[PDB]
Design a binder for this molecule. Structure first.
Ligand SMILES: Nc1nc2c(c(=O)[nH]1)N[C@H]1C(S)=C(S)[C@@H](COP(=O)(O)OP(=O)(O)OC[C@H]3O[C@@H](n4cnc5c(=O)[nH]c(N)nc54)[C@H](O)[C@@H]3O)O[C@H]1N2
Ligand SMILES: Nc1nc2c(c(=O)[nH]1)N[C@H]1C(S)=C(S)[C@@H](COP(=O)(O)OP(=O)(O)OC[C@H]3O[C@@H](n4cnc5c(=O)[nH]c(N)nc54)[C@H](O)[C@@H]3O)O[C@H]1N2
Ligand SMILES: Oc1cccc(O)c1O
Ligand code: SF4
Ligand code: SF4
Ligand code: SF4
Ligand SMILES: [Ca+2]
Ligand SMILES: [Ca+2]
Ligand SMILES: [Mo+4]
Lengths: 875, 274
């Protein structure tokens, strides 16, 4: 009926040009710039060369095959209702997931209209609010979402929910665990949840870098986040400049596999033994920045005596560290000597912070160990800093464009970063208003995402901190309880998505909670029929961002990661065009909520008479875009390449701190009140506290926590091979990083093209199994061969996997990505082995420490064997 | 009469699978009349070979994206009975209709790049997105793999045989199975990473990694390679053909030598304590 039209949209894997014909998406590709209309790129002159980026964007694997997710046959077809669920009769809570228990998920549901589906949910909402109150309505989406600022959870979800209920299951700082509950007490950066700023580090590195230590860092795979493969050419530049690359990772990750000069594979939970041995070496050889430390460190003298083994009687030698980690002493020492004498940047994690190492039982000490090392070498001075090569791009930090974390249309000043700047631009206190929540606040009621099962099945819980406690260093130390004083226990659960079985900890418990009789109603508002969805009573079909109108900037999260668009080679702002009509009977989340708003008699207040496109234009006008083009011109062009800002002065991350002067970067902290004359870190002393004053106060107040000492020390990882009694039964150390070929659950399964990738899933007799990498020596010892179906197990459950024999792991260590989207129990749900590949069924649900209420997934002890075909219904 | 050529740099493959996802995106849900029916799930028109080498802790891995070689002297055109033809620009294409009902075509391929489509009852394979290359509207003017790369692996070009021959000699480009004489137009750069092997080790002196130790590799007694150990005391001699070699090491006047047998495997001599 027509011709092919090139449209624009984006995703968690990068912006894309979308070719559409007769209402069908033909292909999705990376973006080519048009030098006739797109501003020129930045240039960096360094060491005799001129570096400039490619005139194009790039995309991740899961975005390249994203079309198969849009047209997935596992896409939720239309509103669905659990057959065995009768709102006015037998609710049969015990039959939730029954289909799943008989390996026939779909048969559990019957089709129903949107009108009846919403009427049922509304009846439940009103009954529960008048009997127990809005707090009895539990709800939570999850960490990630389809790209698009207006439709993002911080925007649409919150705007509606804040007007309806509700008790939020606030998210634990998953991404930051170690840095958040640990590093924060040592150097602050609460507004970044423990991670360091990264401004203008690319040029500094190109000019001065001689070596980079990638610790728990796989920039290629992770890209920092949302940045496709934008940084690949930057490391190519560094490599060609003669910069050595050393990788310390239990698994020889993908970046290491490509450009490693040397690889270390430490046993799980033993990284801080290496950091301590490197420090010991610098102290014994006087090979560190004493002047720097004398001015910017607190409690270093006491810490030094600990590292030297004076106070505990155990000198932290490279030999001592070899016995702990399996990494050769000589190599540990050689790296220490090279690090000291060369301009070395510490690439802790793939973002400049983060790192799977941070969300493990040794997460706190790893994070502090990284800060300790980078501190000793004078981070901030030319040629020395914490930089993971993914950020620091010279983009125009002065141009303002909101990241999704800034709240969009919700204006929620407490649950989004709208309070920093966006809220003031987006709303006028005259014609458009925000949607605040008087429940999702400290004085209200929320529960930990990591402990939803315990709250539902146990009816009670007590913990530390509320979600992302980035307000100040001590906010995470605040004590909470469930149910909160005066509030009601959960009666209803409104789920947005359903990934927890593959993304949380010891996940069989998330399956178990659904059948508890205390749970009167479970609604699932999702896109694909997978994971947790087959446990709901009512299912509502949402659509992908390719089927609705939105707007966004390449990788721009902002909020707890201020100006993270610096992960890309260019700032690309694009219109997310509605490329096709919603698939099947699905609709945008906003339209779903608008329908509910109408039936809840709050339509006007919720929508303000605006549709998604209307909100997009208003969003557009609240940014700096109008300085370059009107909405109409932008809508027409489809995307905008922010011009370079050649003349702005460069402010390298932490240099101001290194030089003892006033903070001068564009960072969102430290707040003026957390500094004396705006100098120093957010910490009390304004220095790097090896003995954290905040924690020392906490422990002196009576909150004794052995696994989170005020002084950064070698706390043996509670789930490691030589320190846990569990190692007797489960001798193998397993780490489970983020999936290479999927943005967490968004890519895997769904009958997507990604499932055909060799290193993602292995087909065995018709079923594509999740992969677990095993060192040849451990495979051989178990009679396991490449391609065999194996059973990974421990006290928490069993998971069937396809074995991949490799040399990319130190013997005794196994590797299997997390975030599996497929939950496929071989027996009763939550009580049998899963063959979908939900490795998180095996990870420890114990908090990192008594008060550090974060997930410790990457240190899990397991045992594996060839699968005998049994279903193992023993959990 | 300009022809198409493609150059793949093995040293730069990270196996993110953007290529593969690129075909699928282009061929699984789409039909291209005159070129090919829709692709079958599970097929690998673009087959990214994976090969690990050596043993922990001095192991490594390399990848070889393998599409259709569209070789100049194509066996399936010769033995395809007209179901396969060669264009003037070098592209080798299967006739979507003439090929139906003939599973025998797959065997005319020394590289095994074609796959049988059950639903279409026909052999299918790499078309070098001839449909895209034949359409001016496709601004990129290159296949989907190459266009989807974010690792700068692909170099797509349309030039004369002379210019390509010149490029081959300057960059030392190679092809898969040259001995068969099909003359692929898809070249590989740094192919030794995937086809050859290496010998490596870590030299220690008084318990510490020794930097600057002189290492020499010999075959038949004559030097084949040499280098000095880095700060980790390591050296690595790659691109080795199968055979026996001798490694000689001199550090602080202290010498060490041992033999090494390379048999389609790379060897880690481990720590050499001097
Ligand atoms: N072993 C181990 N476990 C880990 C980690 C680790 O390193 N190791 N990493 C941890 C970290 S950092 C994180 S961030 C978590 C990830 O935790 P998440 O909960 O696992 O992961 P997502 O896959 O982003 O899930 C978001 C859900 O929202 C739904 N959704 C997305 N977009 C939309 C939309 O527009 N509308 C609707 N209605 N639904 C939508 C999706 O379908 C999906 O089910 O995993 C953590 N778990
Ligand atoms: N393809 C893809 N990209 C993603 C994501 C995804 O799901 N898929 N997730 C996005 C999100 S939410 C985030 S938060 C960022 C994550 O970005 P990062 O946090 O940088 O990812 P890593 O944390 O480095 O995960 C750890 C890497 O460290 C290794 N590792 C794991 N545990 C340890 C340990 O204890 N010690 C050491 N030395 N190494 C360890 C693993 O082998 C892995 O390669 O990634 C973003 N990018
Ligand atoms: O994965 C992290 C990165 C950005 C925002 C989040 O809410 C998160 O959990
Ligand atoms: S897209 Fe490029 S780096 Fe990725 S697997 Fe294919 S050739 Fe390799
Ligand atoms: S690789 Fe095979 S299919 Fe391609 S042209 Fe050569 S012989 Fe024919
Ligand atoms: S050239 Fe086109 S058909 Fe050939 S492998 Fe590449 S993407 Fe596929
Ligand atoms: Ca140094
Ligand atoms: Ca390689
Ligand atoms: Mo995260």
């Amino acid at each position: 009926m027509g011709e092919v039209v090139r449209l624009t949209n984006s995703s968690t894997g990068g912006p894309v040009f979308v070719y559409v014909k007769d209402g069908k998406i033909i292909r999705m590709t990376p973006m080519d710039f048009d030098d006739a209309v797109d501003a020129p790129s930045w240039k960096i002159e360094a060491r005799g060369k001129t570096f400039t980026p490619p005139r194009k964007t790039s995309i991740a694997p899961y975005t390249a095959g994203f079309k198969s997710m849009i047209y997935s046959d596992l896409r939720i077809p239309y509103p669905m209702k659990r057959k065995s669920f009768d709102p006015n009769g037998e609710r049969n809570p015990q039959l939730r997931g029954a289909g799943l228990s008989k390996q026939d998920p779909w048969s559990d549901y019957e089709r129903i209209s949107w009108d009846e589906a919403t009427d049922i949910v509304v009846a439940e909402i009103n009954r529960i609010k008048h009997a127990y109150g809005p707090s009895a309505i539990l709800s939570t989406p999850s960490s990630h979402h389809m790209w698009g600022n207006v439709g993002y959870r911080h925007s649409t979800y919150f705007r509606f929910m804040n007007m309806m209920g509700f008790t939020y299951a606030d998210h634990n700082p998953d991404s930051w665990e170690g840095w958040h509950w640990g590093g924060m007490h040592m150097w602050g950066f609460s507004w970044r949840l423990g991670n360091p700023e990264q401004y203008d580090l690319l040029e500094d590195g190109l000019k001065h870098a001689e070596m980079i230590v990638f610790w728990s860092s796989d920039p290629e795979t992770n890209s920092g986040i949302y940045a496709g493969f934008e940084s690949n050419i930057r490391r190519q530049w560094l490599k060609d400049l003669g910069v050595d690359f050393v990788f310390i990772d239990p698994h020889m990750n993908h970046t290491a596999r490509l450009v490693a000069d040397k690889w270390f594979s430490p046993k799980i939970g033993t990284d801080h033994a290496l950091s301590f041995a490197i420090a010991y070496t610098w102290l014994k050889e006087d090979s560190y920045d004493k002047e720097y430390v004398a001015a910017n460190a607190h409690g270093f003298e006491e810490w030094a005596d600990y590292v030297l083994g004076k106070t505990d009687g155990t000198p932290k030698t490279c030999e001592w560290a070899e016995e702990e980690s399996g990494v050769p002493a000589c190599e540990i020492r050689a790296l220490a000597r090279q690090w000291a004498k060369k301009n070395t940047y510490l690439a802790a994690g793939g973002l400049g912070g983060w790192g799977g190492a941070c969300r493990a039982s040794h997460g706190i000490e790893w994070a502090r160990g990284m800060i300790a090392l980078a501190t000793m070498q004078g981070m901030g001075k030319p040629g020395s800093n914490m930089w993971s090569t993914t950020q620091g791009v010279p983009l125009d930090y002065e141009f303002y464009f909101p990241g999704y974390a800034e709240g969009g249309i919700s204006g929620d000043c407490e649950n989004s970063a709208a309070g920093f700047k966006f809220a003031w631009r987006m709303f006028d206190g005259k014609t458009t208003f925000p949607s605040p929540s008087n429940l999702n606040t400290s004085a209200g009621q929320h529960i930990p995402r990591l402990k939803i099962p315990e709250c539902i099945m146990g009816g009670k819980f007590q913990w530390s901190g509320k979600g992302f406690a980035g307000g100040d260093i001590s906010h995470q130390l605040h004590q909470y309880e469930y149910p909160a004083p005066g509030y009601s226990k959960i009666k209803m659960f409104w789920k947005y998505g359903g990934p927890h079985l593959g993304t949380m900890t010891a996940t069989n418990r998330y399956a178990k909670m659904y059948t508890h009789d205390s749970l009167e109603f479970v609604v699932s508002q999702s896109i694909w029929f997978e994971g947790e969805v087959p446990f709901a009573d009512i299912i509502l079909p949402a659509c992908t961002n390719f089927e609705r109108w939105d707007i966004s900037e390449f990788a721009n999260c902002s909020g707890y990661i201020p100006d993270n668009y610096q992960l890309c080679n260019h700032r690309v702002i694009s219109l997310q065009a509605k490329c096709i009509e919603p698939v099947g009977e699905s609709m945008s989340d906003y339209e779903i909520y608008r329908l509910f708003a109408k039936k809840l008699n709050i339509e006007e207040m919720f929508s303000e008479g605006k549709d998604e496109l209307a909100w997009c234009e208003q969003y557009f006008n609240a940014t700096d875009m109008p300085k370059y083009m009107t909405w109409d011109e932008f809508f027409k062009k489809g995307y905008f390449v922010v011009p370079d800002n050649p003349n702005r002065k460069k402010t390298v991350a932490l240099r101001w701190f290194a030089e003892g002067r006033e903070k001068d970067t564009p960072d969102w902290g430290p707040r003026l009140n957390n500094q004396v004359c705006r100098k120093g870190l957010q910490t009390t002393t304004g220095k790097v506290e090896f003995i954290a004053t905040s924690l020392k106060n906490f422990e002196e107040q009576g909150y004794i926590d052995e696994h989170r000492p005020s002084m950064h020390t070698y706390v043996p990882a509670w789930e490691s091979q030589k320190h846990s009694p569990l190692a007797v039964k489960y001798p193998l150390g397993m780490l489970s990083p983020h999936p290479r070929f999927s943005m967490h659950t968004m890519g895997d399964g769904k009958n997507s093209y990604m499932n055909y990738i060799k290193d993602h899933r292995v087909e065995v007799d018709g079923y594509k199994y999740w992969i677990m990498r095993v060192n040849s020596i451990d495979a051989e010892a178990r009679g396991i061969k490449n391609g065999d179906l194996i059973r990974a197990y421990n006290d928490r459950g069993s998971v069937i996997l396809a074995a991949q024999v490799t040399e990319c792991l130190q013997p005794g260590t196994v590797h299997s990505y997390e975030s599996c989207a497929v939950y496929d129990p071989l027996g009763t749900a939550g009580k049998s082995a899963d063959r979908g590949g939900c490795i998180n069924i095996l990870t420890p649900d114990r908090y990192i420490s008594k008060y550090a209420c974060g997930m410790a997934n990457n240190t899990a002890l397991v045992e594996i064997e060839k699968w005998d075909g049994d279903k193992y219904e023993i959990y | 009469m300009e022809q198409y050529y493609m150059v793949i740099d093995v040293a730069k493959c990270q196996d993110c699978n953007n290529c593969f996802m690129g075909c699928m995106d282009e061929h699984e849900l789409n039909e291209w009349p005159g070129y090919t029916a829709s692709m079958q799930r599970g097929h690998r028109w673009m087959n990214i070979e994976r090969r690990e080498r050596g043993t922990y802790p001095r192991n490594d891995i390399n990848y070889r994206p393998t599409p259709c070689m569209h070789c100049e002297n194509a066996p399936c055109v010769a033995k395809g009975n007209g179901a396969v033809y060669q264009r003037e620009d070098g592209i080798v294409l299967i006739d979507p209709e003439k090929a139906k009902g003939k599973k025998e075509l797959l065997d005319t391929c020394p590289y095994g790049v074609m796959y049988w489509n059950e639903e279409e009852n026909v052999a299918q394979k790499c078309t070098m997105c001839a449909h895209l290359l034949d359409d001016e509207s496709w601004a990129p003017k290159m296949p989907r793999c190459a266009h989807n790369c974010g690792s700068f692996v692909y170099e797509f070009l349309k030039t004369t045989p002379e210019a390509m021959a010149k490029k081959v000699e300057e960059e030392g480009l190679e092809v898969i199975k040259p001995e068969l004489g099909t003359k692929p137009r898809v070249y590989y750069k740094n192919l030794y990473r995937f086809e050859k092997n290496y010998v490596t080790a870590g030299i220690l002196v008084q318990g510490d990694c020794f930097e600057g130790a002189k290492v020499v590799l010999k075959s038949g007694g004559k030097e084949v390679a040499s280098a000095e150990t880095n700060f980790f005391g390591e050296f690595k001699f790659d691109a080795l053909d199968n055979g026996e070699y001798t490694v000689e090491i001199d550090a602080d006047g202290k010498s060490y030598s041992d033999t090494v047998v390379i048999d389609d495997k790379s060897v880690d001599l481990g720590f050499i304590k001097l």
